[PDB]
Amino acid sequence: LYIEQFGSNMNEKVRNGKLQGIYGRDEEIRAIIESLLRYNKNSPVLVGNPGTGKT
Amino acid sequence: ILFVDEIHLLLGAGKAEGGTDAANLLKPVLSKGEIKLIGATTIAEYRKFIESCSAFERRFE
Numbered sequence: 846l847y848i849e850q851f852g853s854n855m856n857e858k859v860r861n862g863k864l865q866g867i868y869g870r871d872e873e874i875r876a877i878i879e880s881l882l883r884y885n886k887n888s889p890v891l892v893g894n895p896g897t898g899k900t
Numbered sequence: 901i902l903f904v905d906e907i908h909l910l911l912g913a914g915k916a917e918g919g920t921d922a923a924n925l926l927k928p929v930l931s932k933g934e935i936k937l938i939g940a941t942t943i944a945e946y947r948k949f950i951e952s953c954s955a956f957e958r959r960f961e
């Protein structure tokens with residue numbers, strides 16, 4: 846129902862196919878997802894050496 | 901095509917409310933090849949950008 850464009854949409858831009866096919870660090874991805882399903886803490890932060898992929 | 905006389909007048913100087921500062925945008929934009937600027941700085945003063953936050957280091961060339 847919300848406008849949703851106060852920041853920027855992220856799903857629909859990859860639905861356009863602009864950011865398809867990312868080589869993945871699968872142990873890193875699941876580190877997010879397991880932090881995402883917790884009852885209490887629900888906020889991961891990708892702290893990293895600035896050169897690497899964060900976005 | 902964009903040109904900058906001194907990038908120090910963009911990041912070293914500038915209010916947040918007066919325009920682009922170190923805390924404004926174009927930081928996560930200049931990952932992408934969307935915007936094409938051409939700057940001009942001097943070396944020993946360009947070392948302030950490295951010691952400022954060490955984040956423009958891999959966005960400019």
Ligand SMILES: Nc1ncnc2c1ncn2[C@@H]1O[C@H](COP(=O)(O)OP(=O)(O)OP(O)(O)=S)[C@@H](O)[C@H]1O
Binds near residue numbers: 897900928
């Ligand atoms: N795993 C990856 N696969 C492909 N390209 C990658 C990957 N990680 C980073 N990149 C490239 O890195 C560039 C963007 O820089 P990134 O470091 O990814 O951005 P970032 O992680 O947010 O670092 P900051 O925060 O912008 S300084 C783009 O050219 C991406 O294609």
